[PDB]
Amino acid sequence: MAGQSPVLRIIVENLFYPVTLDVLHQIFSKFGTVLKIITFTKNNQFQALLQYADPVSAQHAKLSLDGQNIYNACCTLRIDFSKLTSLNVKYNNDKSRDYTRPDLPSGD
């Protein structure tokens, strides 16, 4: 029952400025260490997931950035606990980014 799974999923709303991982990382990397990260677009829906090192950093972080901005008053980012209690990160290229093991492939 003790899920204890630090995995938050960010969701940008209202396309405005071009974002990236280096940004989302340095962001969540403040409230806690970011083991891994991922980004994608579901039918034109920017979404970047990540995994913390401890649920404590994920709980506070979530609310610490829940419905907040990335610049001033645009690019609304929505954070929420993953569904699979984890993210699929086994490749290092551009769509994904693992800050735990750099000895991973680039997809192919």
Give the start-to-end residue ranges of the domains of the chain: 1-108
Structure-determination technique: NMR
CA distance 61 to 55: 9
1-108 CATH: 3.30.70.330
Helices (H), the chain: 21-31, 55-64
Q: Which two tokens stand for residue 18?
A: 């071009």
CA distance 18 to 56: 30
Q: Which two tokens stand for residue 104?
A: 């991973």
Contact indicator for 34, 40 with CB cutoff of 8 Å: no
Q: Which residues contact 29 (CB under 8 A, 6 or more apart)?
A: 99
Strand partners, 69: none
Which 8-state DSSP code applies to residue 66?
T
Contact indicator for 98, 31 with CB cutoff of 8 Å: no
Residue for token digits 């979530």?
Answer: 62
Q: Which two tokens stand for residue 105?
A: 């492939």
Distances, alpha carbon 28 to alpha carbons 3, 9, 43, 75, in Å: 21, 11, 25, 16
* CB-facing half-sphere around the CA of 67: CA atoms within 13 A: 1
CA distance 6 to 55: 4
